[PDB]
From a paper:
Topo2As regulate DNA topology by creating a four base-pair-staggered double-stranded break (DSB) in one DNA duplex, passing another DNA duplex through this break and then resealing the break. As part of a structure-based approach to develop novel bacterial topo2A pharmacophores, we co-crystallized and determined structures of DNA-cleavage complexes of the S. aureus B27-A56(GKdel) fusion truncate (gyraseCORE) with QPT-1, etoposide and moxifloxacin.
We further solved a 2.65-Å binary complex with this DNA (without compound).
Numbering used by the authors:
A (entry chain B): 417 to 545, 580 to 640
B (entry chain D): 417 to 545, 580 to 639
C (entry chain A): 9 to 491
D (entry chain C): 10 to 490
Write the structure that this text describes.
Amino acid sequence: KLADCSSKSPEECEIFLVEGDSAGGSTKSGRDSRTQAILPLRGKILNVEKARLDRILNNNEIRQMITAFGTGIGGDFDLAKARYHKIVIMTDADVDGAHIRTLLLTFFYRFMRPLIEAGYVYIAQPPTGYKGLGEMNADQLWETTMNPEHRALLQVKLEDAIEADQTFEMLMGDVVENRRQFIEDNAVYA
Amino acid sequence: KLADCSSKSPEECEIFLVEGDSAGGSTKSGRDSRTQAILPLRGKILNVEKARLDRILNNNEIRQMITAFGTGIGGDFDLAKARYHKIVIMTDADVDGAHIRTLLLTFFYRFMRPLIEAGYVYIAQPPTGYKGLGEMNADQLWETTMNPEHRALLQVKLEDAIEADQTFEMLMGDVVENRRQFIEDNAVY
Amino acid sequence: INERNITSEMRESFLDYAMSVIVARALPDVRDGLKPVHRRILYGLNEQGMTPDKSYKKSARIVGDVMGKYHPHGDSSIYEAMVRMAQDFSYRYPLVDGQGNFGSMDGDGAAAMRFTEARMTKITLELLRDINKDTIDFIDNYDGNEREPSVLPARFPNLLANGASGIAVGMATNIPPHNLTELINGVLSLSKNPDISIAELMEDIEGPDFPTAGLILGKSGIRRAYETGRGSIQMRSRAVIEERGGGRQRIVVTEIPFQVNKARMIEKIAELVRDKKIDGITDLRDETSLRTGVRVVIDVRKDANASVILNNLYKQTPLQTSFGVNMIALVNGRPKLINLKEALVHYLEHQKTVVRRRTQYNLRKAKDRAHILEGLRIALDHIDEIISTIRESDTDKVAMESLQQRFKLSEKQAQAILDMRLRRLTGLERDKIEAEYNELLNYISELETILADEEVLLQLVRDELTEIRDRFGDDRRTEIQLG
Amino acid sequence: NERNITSEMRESFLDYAMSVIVARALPDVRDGLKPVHRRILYGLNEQGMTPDKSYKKSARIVGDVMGKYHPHGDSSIYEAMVRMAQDFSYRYPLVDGQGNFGSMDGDGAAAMRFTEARMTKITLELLRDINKDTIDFIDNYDGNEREPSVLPARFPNLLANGASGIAVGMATNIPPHNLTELINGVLSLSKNPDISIAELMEDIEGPDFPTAGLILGKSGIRRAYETGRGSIQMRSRAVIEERGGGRQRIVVTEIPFQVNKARMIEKIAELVRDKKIDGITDLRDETSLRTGVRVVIDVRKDANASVILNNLYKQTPLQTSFGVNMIALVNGRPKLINLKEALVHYLEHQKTVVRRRTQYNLRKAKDRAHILEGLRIALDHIDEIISTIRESDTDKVAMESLQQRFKLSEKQAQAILDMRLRRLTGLERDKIEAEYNELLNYISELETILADEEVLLQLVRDELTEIRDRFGDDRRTEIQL
DNA sequence: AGCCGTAGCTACGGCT
DNA sequence: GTACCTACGGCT
DNA sequence: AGCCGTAG
Ligand SMILES: [Mn+2]
Ligand SMILES: [Mn+2]
Ligand SMILES: [Mn+2]
C-alpha cells in the first residue's frame, strides 16, 4: 500500500499516514512525489496498549509502518536508520480522525519513543469543518495540508515521560473505570 | 457455500443453483431444508466451451458443483452416485439470468451429459417481470418457485445430440463470426 | 502554534472522541429511545413521505438521502441500523416495514440495499406524530444546509418497548425490550401517583418481553435491574421432551433466547457432542421452516434421561443465556444509569411537554387564522370598495397601504385579500368564512381550557396513551417462570 | 412442463446477445450514449444538478439513477459516471466531479460516499430542450417512471467523446474528435448532402485524444473514415535533451490514449531489469499536478538516445495503436458506419429536434395567448365579471355564466376564477397586455420557421455555430505526415 | 497474452 | 474499513 | 472466548 518518494535522502523525505484509501489515492496525486511518501490506513488502527506483542507484530497496518520507517521497534530501534525525518499524521478534522490520531500516537510512544524525542512525529492540519479528507480534491489537499509553503504542521513534543506513561495507560489501557473517571471529570456539555 | 438438505436419499433430494448470494440466503430461509439444497453462484460463471481443462478444474464455482453433485466428470461420471435427482437452475427472469442459464447448461452438456439424459436437469420458473430473485421475500420464493405444490419446473430434454453439439459450439465457442451470423439471422428488433 | 505536547494532544483528542460516541453515537435518548442514526432514518422516512399508506422505496435511495442530509458516516452503518428496525426477531415493535430479504435468526444478513425496499410501520407514525407542530426542538444539520430533530415526539415509550444495546467509551448500555400494554399501564399508574414504588410499577410491568419470546427464570434479577438499573436476567429456550417412536425420546426447542444466533447455538451443541463433553445425543437437526416456525430437534439415546441432557444443554450451550441489564441512557444530554421509575418519569415529562407545546402551537395557528378570516370578512362586506382600491393602485405596495388605512387592516390581512382568487367572491363564501370563524373561536376556547389546567393536560396525555395501547398493545410473549 | 436444450440455448442466448447490443454495450448514433450514460445525465437533469447549483453526493446520484431507471449494480453506474468526469478519458467531460475521481496511473476514484458530482456546462447542450417534446419518452423498467429514448444532443457527442464497448458477436471502438472540426464538418454537410469523405476530412483532420500525443500518418485515419475500420498509430510526445556533463535524457510529456502511465513505466522498468533494452541508467515519474505529465528516461553517456527511444516505441506502450471499429445503434440496430454516415444521422436528429421544439413552442404560445385573451376580456369588463361571480352560488355556476356572457372557453373562465385580486393593480394589468403583444410576435417568428425548411436548417446551423464558438477548443493530438 | 468497459481487518464495554 | 472471480470482442 | 451494534 506504500507509495514511496523519489529521493532516498531521509533528511528531506516526509511520510504521510492518511486515513482511508479514498484520501490515500487523492494525496498520492496532489503530493510532491520526489520528497513525499503516502501510507494509507484502512480506518481504525489496532490499540497497542490493549493488544499483546504477538498480535501487534502480526497486524498488517503495524508491519507496513515498521517496514516504511525502517528503524525497527523497541530495543532494536535505530534512529540513524529512519527513512523519513518527518512522519506526518494526516486524519479527518472530526472525532474519528482524532481517535485514529490517538491510536497512532499510542503505537509511536510504546514502540518508537525516540522518534517523538527527535521531533520526527508531526500532525497535519487539514481545513476545519464538516468535510473529510476523502471528499477533497488532490490540489486542495496539497495547497492546504501538504505544500511546505502554506501548510501548518504541529511538531509532537514529549515534556514529561512519567505523565505521558500515566496518560497512555489511563486513556488507552484495559482499565475502563479510570478512563470513565477521566471522562466524567473533564466532560463539558455546553 | 453449499447449504445441504437433511435427507440423504437422492431420489427425493433437490439442489437449487441460485444467481447471487442475496437470493442464496433468501432461498435458504424459504426452502424445505429436509429435501432442498442451495448452492449460490456469485454471478457470471466460466464458459467451459472457451476455457482450457486446467482452468475449468481450477475454477471454484465449477468444483463446488462437482463436489455437491458427487457424480464426477466426463469419463469418470457415475449417475448412480448422484446426490440429487433434481438439479434446478434458478436464475432471474432477465437477460443476465438467461446468460447464467446458458453458461450452466454448457457445463452440464460438456462434463455431465448423462445427467441431462436421465432428466435430472431442470429450469426453475420464477415470477416474470422487473423484479429479480434477490429482491424477493423468502416466502414468495417458496410459494412461486420452490414449493412442489405450486411450482412449474421445466425438465431439460436432449432430442438431437448432433444438433446440440453444433448449437453449443456456435453460441458458446471461440468463433465469433458464426455467433454474429446467428444473431443477424434470428434478430427481431 | 508550531508545537504540541503529546499529553495535552492525547487528553484533548481522546476526550473529544469519547464524548461524541457517548452523546452522538452509541447511547439512546431517554425520551424517544433512539440513537442519532435511528432518529435520522425515521425522520428521513418522514421527510421522504415514506408513510405506511405509500408504496415501498429502494433502501439505497433512503440510506443515500439520510447520509447526505443528516448522517455523514458509512452507508453500511445506516443500512444495517434500518435493517434491524425491520427484523421482528430484533425489534419487539418493528419501526421499519421492509420488502425483500431482511435477514433471519441464523445471523443471515439482509440483501444488498440495491435489492431491498422500505417504508414506515404504523407504530412509527406514533413516534413522528406532531413533529411539525413545534413539539420538539429542531437543530442545524452537520453542514448547516438542513434542519433535523434533537428528539422525536415518541407518543409510546420506545426506550423500554424496543430496548437498546450500545458500546460507547468508558461505558455501555443494555436495556431489554418490554410489552407495550404493560408499559403504558405503568406510565398511567405513575401519572396518577408520582410517589409510586418500583414494586407497585412491577404490578403493571412484569419484566422484559423479548420478540423471540422464550422463558425468564425468576423475578430477583428483574427486581434488581428495575431498582438499580443493573441486574442479571436468566433467559431460557422454550424446550419440551416428547416421544419419537420405539420407546425413544427427543428435545424440541421452539423458542430461543433474545439475540442468540440459532445456527451458532446449533454448532455449539454439535461441537459438545463431537468433543464428547455431553452424553446421550444421537441426532441434531434444524427443522425450522417459514411454515412450522422455529423447531430444533435433539434426538435422545434410548433409555437415557432427556431431562438431564436438557439441563446440561442449558448449562453448556446458549440454550440458556443471561441478559446483563445496564440501563444507561442520555438524560438532559448526559449519560446516566437509570432505574425503571426514572425511565418512566423522564418519558412522562417528555409527553407532557409534547402535548403542551402542541396545544400552544394549535392556539397560535388558530388565532392567526381567526385574524385572517376577520380581514376576509371586511373584504367581502366592502368588496366593491376593495376592488376599486386595488384597481386605482399602480403597485402592490400602494394597494397594501391603501387597504390597511381605509379598512383598518393589518399587513397580513391586506396580503390575504390581495392573494384572494376571484372564485372566493361566490355567493356562499361569506357564509363559509363566518361558519369557519365561529368554529375557530370555539376551538381557541377548547385549547385555552387545556393550557389553563395542568390536570386537563395530563388527562389528555393519559387518553392519547390509552388509544395507542388499545391499537398497538399486544399479548406478552416471554413467560416469567417462578423461579 | 418440458424444454429442448437446443431451443432453450438458442432462445436464451439470443435474448441476452440482443440486450447487450441494443441496451448495454453499443452507443446510439444520435447522442453517442449507452443506456447507463443517458440515464446518469437524465438523472442529473431531473435531480436539478446543473453547473450553477452546488455538488451532490455521488451515492445519492447513483442510488436515484439505479432505483428510477437503471436496475443494475451501483459499481456499473458509478464507474460510468467517474469516466465522464475524467479529463484524460473524455475529450469533453460530461460530469463535473468533486474529490478523487482517479488518475492516469489507473488509480480509481474515491468511494461513492466521499465524492460529489454535477453537470458540466457542455452537458447542458446534451439535455437542452429535453422537456420541449424534442425526443420520445419511454416507460422505465417497472413502469413507475418515464425516461428518454435519446437525448437532444445539440453537439455531435458520438464522435466528440468517442466510444468503446464489448457486446456479443461484435464490439465498438470510436475515437474522440475535436469539436470545432466536427461542427465545421456538420456545417459543410448541411450545405452539400453529396459531400465526400475526402471533402469532410478538410474539416475533420482525424481523431483528437484528450491525452493529446501524436498520430503517425493519414492512411489509417482515411481507411477508418471511409469504411468504419482502420488502424491508427498513436505515439507519445517525447523529446531528447541534455541533463549535464555530456549526458542526455528522454522526456515524455504526453502518452497515448487509454494507456496506463504506471503500467507503461513498469514495462520500461521490466525491460531494463530483464536486459531486453540497452542504454537506460534511470527511470523516474516526475509527473505532478503543477508541471503536468513528465516521464524521464536517463540515457547512458555516449549512447544514442534516438535509438533507445525508437526501441521503446517498438517494445513498450509508448507507441500504441487504436483499432477503429465504428459500430453504433442506427434505427435501434447495430451498424458499421463511416464518417459521413455518422454525421448524416446526427444532422437528421438535429433537424428533428429543432422542428419538434418550434412546434412545441408554438402550441404552448398559442395556449398561453388564448389564456391572456380571456384575461384581457376579464379586465375590460371587470365590473360585469365580478357581479357574474358574486351572483353565482358555486364555482361550476360561475364557470358556465362567464362562458355564456363573455364568449369564453372552459380554460379561459377557469383562468379568470383563478386570478388573484393583486392582478387588478395598474402594473399587473399592463403586464398581461405586455406579455400578449410579445407572444403574438413570438407566434409569428415560430410560424416563419415552420413555413420554410431552409430557415429551419439555417437555425440548426446558427445554433451549432454558437456551441462551436463557446465550447470549441484547439486540437491536442498532432497528426504527423 | 491481457487489457479496454458495462454486466452478474480494526475500537469500544461487559459478560463473570 | 477493503476484493477479485466471471462474459464478451478485438487488438497486441 | 467472542459476540452484541455503530463507527473507520
Ligand atoms: Mn471522517
Ligand atoms: Mn438480475
Ligand atoms: Mn447456557
